[PDB]
Symmetry: D2
Subunit: 242 residues, 4 copies
């Protein structure tokens, strides 16, 4: 997370951390609890190569990374079959926890958007995670969860930003319909936030609009953060999650 | 280059090395002289972001990198308009030298293939360059140009291989029609070889079948090297090059 | 710390962590509380070059580095004037805290040895710290304080051990009388443990025998850990600490 | 070498490169040819730990490292017995080549100084090598041999300077009688120059005044390069070298 600050303990109870086995269970991506037994994340976090589930754990909302881990095992990893790169799209996956979580006040699900929802350019959206605080700058110990408000930028506008200072034909679409742009030169997600939630408040309800997916660097000029657009994948999600 | 060996001084007169301005003029990509004033390379070597022409130089065939440099300024960089990631394709670019080179017998052009050439398996093909000699393993000083003979694999055969050990649906095509596959677990191209020539001997003449483009690591199981297919882009090449 | 295990929360209440200002207040050396207002540590942690007082802080006994820091400013760094390299000796220094520590049962001073105590082999001694868990191997988050029981040996055997497999003349003293040696191929202090305490239980009282100083690698054959022999410097210490 | 300039191809015919076996025969220290069968270098380059002869090669003077290698095996490594740390001193060693070298125009021995020569300030002196060109900055390909003219500083003056901005007591001698000091903030040897020659033009002959030994960083204020004083060890050298 670039800009923004430490998240208050009461906020973002759906934020999760994905751990990879090694000399310790190291954070490598974010995710959200969308159901007591399912976590939504980015496909590029766990794919396209198939890995061993024994080497993966999930950690539920935690104020500081590593401090009081209660790692949860995963029984299934479901990666969108269209996925193989973030730029091509379909950057979305589901992890089934071995057991339902006993859901509470500091840990509970985020609500997915209705099939209609648009999230117009200039709305209140927040992205959260334990990722880098700038290009090539790790979040320092004790690794607090970070939050930052980012402005939505509608797709065509965002796609045109991405053509500025690049060779790509203006007719070539870079920002796809299954994606969504947010952020600017001061507020953005970064490496290690991948797979985590972009949420927006609408009618007093937090809806997860996006999954942190990709972009060119973090908070670079004319390169807003790119998210997988959740509404686009609702039908696929509900094929697995109650 | 993975596997293979140091090239003889006579061979591959069209091989060039791309240099970026820094603490020294460092090699970053390969290329081939296809016309006394034009170099064929990979788009991902120079794009998709537009960079400064003054930060770039071309070195013509040289047995050891850096030893007897004679760097050539470039007057313009032409990247295929469809390009923005190597996986999406159109990974091909052209460099116009400020001046034609005084063609030699140590330096001269490679022949482009006729549009009809398919380069089927069994064809004798070589890739060359000064890239890494294995994953994360640098070519050591004095940086001899290396060469390696790689077996060609049909696109659809290569496509299936990239689905082994991957989540990606069988209906999702990874190896595209503008691509070509070559190499195995002992012979392949690598980081630093990008942009360089895959050439095959056809009825006595060496034709450039491909441009080193991408792949999953180097010489990994079920992950043949992927090249931009030169035939596919002949019309685009011919629009610029005499 | 190499070998051994996480310290129980009630143990080693005199252990401290020295922090250097940066992107965060990063642990760089250990120390020990020897008086409510004085920390004992290694000279090579703070010298031979004089650094800015304002770039240093002291952290008292924590289970886990960084998580609930209460950083303390220092008013004086006093380095033994004989010191310039650990290999030569006098590797000892004192930090005066701006204000006295209000001691409890989780934070309090360690007792210094009488001048007469030689800490012969067979004595039960532990070294504690947040240092590397092996050669070139960082302590993993969440950075628990570690402890290891290490065998004390005599100076003459430690000196001779260091000549083993080395060119140095047998008549050249490497391990000097102001040093003390402990550890083996399985139990040792390491980088990041420097300046921290080696303590032994004598007559049911814990006495600080040494200050982590140097050695060749950690837990290497014939290279035991070398500590500054605290008894050697009692007079100097007592010029400053009441 | 911090800085100076590339050496002219006719200069310093006695300079040698020491190479350690690995992925390639990598330069790690310099040395000088003082006899057709003996190389003079620094002790810390080959000790104090005894290493295997098979892992070492000597390369005679090359204009550019690695390009025309003709590696020479060593049959004896002789390390001064007083040595264990560069800062304590006796940082001098001898390599006996397996076979004598056939002296050329481009390769010949450097003359040792008469015991009487003190090398006062104001003498024309050069240090040479393929070491770093600044703190943590490698010599770039093609690795030209560098030379820099360095100002000699008297021992007592240099010793005093090493106390500037340090805690070390004034009556503690840092720069010893078997050392010599040279360089300033624009001119110094550096990592990788270790073991190489400091030479001075005296009465029409180049004499080797010093062997590159140590210093606090390279070209830092009040921290001139420290060399092993050759005259101090003439007896020891002549015990081995005809
Ligand atoms: N901040 C969100 C954001 C969030 C998480 C995250 C990134 C960006 C990464 C994504 C990949 N990455 C890259 O930098 C990258 C990979 C591919 C491209 C591109 C492009 C491009 C295409 C057309 C025109 C211009 C540029 O940029 C580093 C930043 C690392 O993980
Ligand atoms: N050796 C040719 C080859 C030649 C040059 C070169 C590479 C490979 C790179 C390409 C990018 N890279 C990768 O590692 C990479 C980037 C994207 C993927 C992938 C994939 C995949 C897609 C679908 C199914 C399975 C895997 O792998 C390192 C090796 C670096 O430069
Ligand atoms: N484990 C305690 C221990 C505790 C902390 C610590 C070390 C060792 C270091 C000390 C320096 N270092 C070295 O490795 C080193 C520096 C100097 C020498 C030497 C020597 C020698 C002298 C005579 C004969 C043979 C060798 O070895 C890495 C391990 C790093 O910090
Ligand atoms: N440029 C010659 C020079 C030539 C070669 C070379 C160095 C210096 C090194 C020596 C070691 N090193 C250090 O930096 C170092 C090791 C020990 C000390 C010290 C000290 C000191 C003692 C008393 C008072 C003040 C400082 O500094 C980096 C530069 C590495 O290789």
């Amino acid at each position: 997370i670039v800009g923004g600050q430490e998240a208050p303990r009461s906020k973002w109870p759906w934020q999760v951390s994905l751990r990879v086995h090694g000399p310790y269970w190291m954070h490598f991506c974010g995710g959200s609890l969308i159901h007591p037994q399912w976590v939504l994340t980015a496909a590029h976090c766990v794919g396209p190569d198939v890995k061993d589930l024994a080497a993966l754990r999930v950690q539920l909302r935690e104020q500081h990374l590593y401090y009081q881990d209660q790692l949860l095992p995963v029984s299934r990893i479901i990666v969108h079959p269209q996925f193989y790169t973030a730029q091509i799209g379909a950057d979305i996956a589901l992890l089934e926890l071995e057991e339902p979580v006993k859901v509470s006040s500091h840990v509970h699900t985020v609500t997915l958007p209705p099939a209609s929802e648009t999230f117009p350019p200039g709305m209140p959206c927040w992205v959260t995670g334990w990722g880098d605080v700038d290009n090539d700058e790790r979040l320092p110990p004790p690794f607090p969860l970070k939050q930052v408000k980012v402005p939505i930028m509608e797709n065509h506008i965002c796609d045109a930003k991405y053509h500025l200072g690049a060779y790509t034909g203006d007719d070539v679409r870079i920002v796809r319909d299954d994606m969504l742009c947010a952020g600017n030169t001061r507020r953005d997600s970064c490496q290690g936030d991948s797979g985590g939630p972009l949420v927006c408040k609408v009618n007093g309800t937090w809806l997860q609009a996006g999954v942190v997916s990709w972009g060119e660097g973090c908070a670079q000029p004319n390169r807003p953060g790119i998210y997988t657009r959740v509404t686009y994948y609702l039908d696929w999600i509900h094929h697995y999650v109650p």
